[PDB]
């Protein structure tokens, strides 16, 4: 149809008269603290379901075919999961069992607190390389070696293989005690709005240089050499150099079966993911490559006639708990505190991802206290930070899963080839563990292909993955988070600091108004010069709002009064002997400001005493009920700048000023 | 008065299809490289006319309250600048004989280079212990230590002079002058935006502390406390501490002196304030005060009867000037960046604390150049760093004072006090002027009352000025404005994203929308509900939108999908066997106060949508300008079904769509 209307000019007193406004309730804080305080049995009992989930989907099982769903995805996620575990344990620095004790316990911790239904808890590249990397800061190699060994020279300062593994175990436990406190604090204080912070971008270009940094430390195991453990500023690029002078030091038949292995997954994977439609079950290519690498290094000693690289550690049982030892918290905080955040936010990543996949609903505080509790429970059992891994996640998810009885399912596997089964993975090389890993990098590297993308959407948005990838290669990783996150606010502020001002004008015989400078047949008014400034002032973009006034006036409020204070004497000085010209008002559409930071409205004010003085009025168009009831509070409407001054909209400014020139010359 | 605006409801679609864009000019450098200056005079001037800010206000001024004002107050800054000189200089690990030159030679340079006024360039407080730091550091404390003067045992390991604090001047000299090049190359690329972060209560509560600061840095000179050195962290509180642990030796006749000082020097001031009608020139007591405790000490010998401790080491006689070394500028560099950057913040920050008070707004990049030349300039003279005292600046604001001519004759003082007004200021007290200061000093203190009026105003800034306050006291002067400055910049970034969200509603017979939580007797569109967010949809509020729109609408978009395809599962196999949805139709986002959108803003955005279409509940939106609409288009926010004509160009016509289609 059609849009007519017809009002009198209700500026700002011409509205408020009229309209009793709604009082706003009384806070009686005593009243407020008591009354929130819950004590019904209703309230008790929701909060009891939300803490453990656990008591919700189980009286609603459909066991008929659930049964055979569950034990066919636990089975498969078991192997995948003790697989991923044995993989990642020489990430943490620690022996081969300790991935298989963290891919049994914190599953177990979070069947009976999660929220999720196909997370799949447990170890993960980025998480292990993160706290093999603050083992190796906190207890490095150079410092358990003992002299024996009846050495030429001098003493022998051997490896200190042995007690050195206790404590790299020791460490890595406090280190997942402080995680699981930390995710604990965050939850129960119900702030969770710290990991919002973590954009996509910024978690694109965190994982991006992870995969990369993880690549380089699997290709320095597949190769068997011998660094020290570079960790602080450039330390990838450091050990990385000494790799590329160090390769005289190699492994030829292990570097050989490494990238053998390599091409056969990646193939393998690629088939898989491609030619989906005729295979339904994907073809657990990393089990078969496993049990292959099992059979042959098993009937040729190649440990003694190759000199490749196996376990041989296994001691295939169970230890008591250890208490950990507290009193390294203070040095490791940051380091627990980046930890815990990056696999929050990987987690919750995953969860929405597998959540808008199956169309249910998956808590983020919920999640974030069952991360804390795994974490908790792991760090009396000598277990290290778990999370969830897209690939390991993924089998699940396509084997078929309904609920978290499948992952109950999948520590049964763990929990069988930890207790008697796994000393048949003696011979074993490292390097095959060492190859699943990058291939599972496939996702993560094929993230850079988003660069062309995103530079022609908003640039700033590519600047931010571009700075987060690169920063967090220079100055390490744990550190380049935080200089990520900062460098987001600053754009942030950057982009709240220059607003995007235009020349807003009006379309003939219309009401609304659009900007100058995309457009061409607009009317402007006769004298008047409309301006509308987005990003709201505050003490940092004031300057700017001044500039742009001056822009658009194409004056200066302060040289125009200074040349009238010059010419003033002139003329006092003329009668004892014997610019400003178009500019007639100023309508400012502050219609996209939100806060008003008092600082600025003394500057605001300034300005509109100053515009006063050369006889140029400055008006508002647009202004909101909660920026004017701010205002009001920060000593803004006094004897002179009544209430007058403001409009409700952007024509009614334009149309009282009409008919001010029409009625008053 | 009414007004027709009888006009078709227009959408993106419907209005763009009529009317015509303008081509978007892309400014390529290639050849608009030279459009700046290249050859018009007039560009030529006016750089010039501001690298020299001397042609502005000294052809300018107005001798009425100009003369007789500035030299009594020249002389007060003057005093209190010989002082500082002679002070700081033994703090700094070198002799006491250059800290007159500092505030000599640099206020000539900025008396032509330069335009703000109230500052009195020289030594700072917290600035002279930073050179000391780099000199012990990088210098030995005994560099030959001759081991001769027939001790008692073993030789006598006397420490060398004469050669050690010549190293120690040279060495000061030339971190000056590399602090001094690298202020000035920051001027090249012109950064002259970092001022404008600097927020009136950020720089209200920064220099509030360092008043209490400079107010313990002269309390144990004014009680002759020996008290250690301590920088970085808890430096206020364990000076504080110190002073009251070792209060024992305190020296009584300096204590009654210099306290019976204080009181006479602030009540003067007060009654000058209140008489300012009666008497037209402010009184000099600091000069009054200077010359009758010259008399009470030369006359009694405070010093050598009653040990209350005296200067009795005034030099005498200028220095030629002494090429510094080249090559050990390496060493310093490496230093001088962490002492350049908070000396060009104590800089600025005591010029904004006096712009409130006084419209004397200053820029940035103007001061970068004129402070950088000006320890250039203090440079090959073996000066110190030209920076600018808070006790100096507030004795010549208070009491008077116009121009920075209050300066310029504040060196003729000190020129005149080297070379023929050494053996004057000898018996000084150094009570008198050490106190001096502190009743200037209130200037600052009772800028703490701004605490009630900033919190009936605005929560925000109230509680940015007491967390710089409190903050600068334990992580210093040096730590404490970098960390107030990330937290102002936290208040900006927190502001925009947990905005004031409510609920628009029109007012009746009318088009006028306005919120429905701060007025009544207002109506609701029948099926059709207004939200407004009024923030930008970056990153930080993607959820934070979610939540908005879940807890306005009553339901949650979310849930009524799962438990949609529940039922409808259940009545699936119902069939087979045998056999909470609000009424809102549509939902308006008036997202029109949006500035900028981000990656995640779009493709969250997009997901509201296709999350609303299969409750059958349709989503509208309102005014995207000229950014936050091209923006969109761009990011491959239209697909295949999502169109422009969902948008609209004012809000009422969202109403008038949604009526007449039902």
Same mark, same amino acid.
């Given at each position: 149809?059609?849009? %007519?209307?017809?009002? =009198?000019?209700? @500026? ?16 009686? +804080?005593? !009243? ?43 089975? @498969?996620?078991? &192997? ?10 020489? &990430? ?52 358990? &070696? ?5 050495? #030429?020279?001098?003493?022998?300062? %051997? +490896? ?26 965050? /939850? ?15 978690? /694109? ?31 990838? $690029? ?34 898989? *993911? ?7 079950? =994907?073809?657990? $290519?990393?089990? $078969?490559?496993?049990? $292959? ?19 041989? @550690?296994?001691? #295939? ?13 203070? *040095?490791? +905080? ?24 199956? *169309?249910?609903?998956? !808590? ?28 390991? %996640?993924?089998?699940?998810? #396509? ?7 499948? /992952? ?12 008697? +089964? ?37 640039? %700033? ?37 220059? =607003? #995007? ?29 409309? &301006? ?45 002997? /014997? ?9 400012? !559409? ?48 006094? !004897? ?26």
């Amino acid at each position: 149809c059609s849009y %007519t209307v017809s009002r =009198p000019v209700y @500026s700002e007193l011409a509205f408020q008269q009229q309209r009793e406004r709604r009082l706003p309730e009384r806070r009686t +804080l005593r !009243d407020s603290l008591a009354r929130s305080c819950s004590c019904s049995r209703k309230r008790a009992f929701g909060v009891v379901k939300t803490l453990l989930p656990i008591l919700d989907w189980l009286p609603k099982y459909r066991v008929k075919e659930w049964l055979l769903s569950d034990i066919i995805s636990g089975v @498969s996620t078991g &192997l995948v999961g003790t697989l991923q575990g044995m993989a990642y344990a020489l &990430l943490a620095a620690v022996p081969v069992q300790f991935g298989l004790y963290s891919a049994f316990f914190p599953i177990l911790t979070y069947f009976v607190f999660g929220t999720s239904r196909h997370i799949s808890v447990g170890p993960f590249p980025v998480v292990s390389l993160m706290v093999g990397s603050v083992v190796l800061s906190m207890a490095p190699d150079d410092h358990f &070696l003992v002299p024996s060994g009846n050495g #030429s020279a001098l003493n022998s300062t %051997t +490896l200190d293989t042995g007690t050195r593994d206790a404590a790299r175990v020791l460490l890595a436990s406090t280190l997942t005690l402080l995680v699981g406190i930390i995710q604990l604090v965050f /939850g129960g204080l119900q702030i969770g709005f710290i990991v919002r912070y973590l954009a996509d971008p910024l978690v /694109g270009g965190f994982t991006t240089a992870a995969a990369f940094q993880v690549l380089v430390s699997q290709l320095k195991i597949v190769l068997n050499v011998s660094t020290k453990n570079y960790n602080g500023i450039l330390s990838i $690029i450091y050990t990385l150099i000494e790799i590329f002078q160090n390769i005289g030091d190699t492994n030829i038949a292990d570097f050989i079966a490494g990238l053998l292995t390599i091409i056969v997954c990646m193939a393998v994977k690629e088939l898989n *993911d491609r030619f989906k439609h005729r295979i339904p079950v =994907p073809i657990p $290519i990393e089990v $078969i490559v496993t049990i $292959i690498a099992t059979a042959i290094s098993y009937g040729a000693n190649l440990e003694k006639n190759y000199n490749a690289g196996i376990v041989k @550690s296994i001691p #295939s049982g169970f230890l008591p708990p250890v208490l950990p030892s507290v009193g390294l918290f203070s *040095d490791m +905080l940051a380091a627990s505190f980046s930890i815990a955040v990056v696999a929050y936010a990987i987690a919750v990543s995953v969860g929405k991802v597998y959540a808008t996949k199956h *169309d249910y609903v998956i !808590d983020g505080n919920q999640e974030f206290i069952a991360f804390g509790i795994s974490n908790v429970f792991s760090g009396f059992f000598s277990c290290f930070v778990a999370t969830t891994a897209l690939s390991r %996640t993924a089998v699940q998810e #396509s084997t078929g899963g309904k609920t978290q009885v499948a /992952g109950l399912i999948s520590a049964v596997i763990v929990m069988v080839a930890i207790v008697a +089964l796994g000393r048949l993975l003696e011979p074993l090389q490292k390097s095959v563990l060492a190859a699943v890993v990058i291939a599972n990098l496939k996702g993560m590297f094929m993230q850079v292909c988003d660069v062309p993308r995103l530079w022609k959407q908003n640039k %700033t948005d590519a600047v931010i993955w571009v700075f987060t990838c690169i920063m967090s290669i220079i100055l390490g990783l744990d550190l380049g988070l935080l200089a990520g996150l900062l460098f987001a606010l600053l754009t942030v502020v950057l982009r709240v600091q220059f =607003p #995007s001002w235009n020349g807003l004008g009006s379309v003939p015989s219309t009401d609304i108004y659009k900007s100058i400078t995309h457009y061409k047949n607009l009317e402007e008014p006769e004298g008047v010069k409309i &301006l509308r400034f987005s990003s709201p002032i505050f003490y940092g973009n004031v300057d700017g709002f001044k500039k742009c006034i001056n822009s658009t006036v194409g004056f200066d409020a302060i040289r125009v009064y200074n040349k009238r204070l010059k010419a003033l004497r002139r003329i006092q000085k003329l009668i004892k002997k /014997g610019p400003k010209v178009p500019i007639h008002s100023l309508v400012l !559409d502050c219609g996209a400001v939100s806060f008003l930071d008092v600082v600025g409205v003394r500057s605001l004010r300034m300005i509109v005493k100053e515009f006063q003085r050369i006889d140029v009025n400055v008006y508002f168009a647009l202004l909101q009920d909660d920026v004017l009831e701010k205002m009001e509070q920060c000593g803004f409407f006094d !004897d002179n700048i009544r209430k007058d001054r403001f409009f409700l909209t952007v024509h009614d400014a334009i149309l009282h000023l009409q008919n001010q020139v029409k009625s008053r010359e």
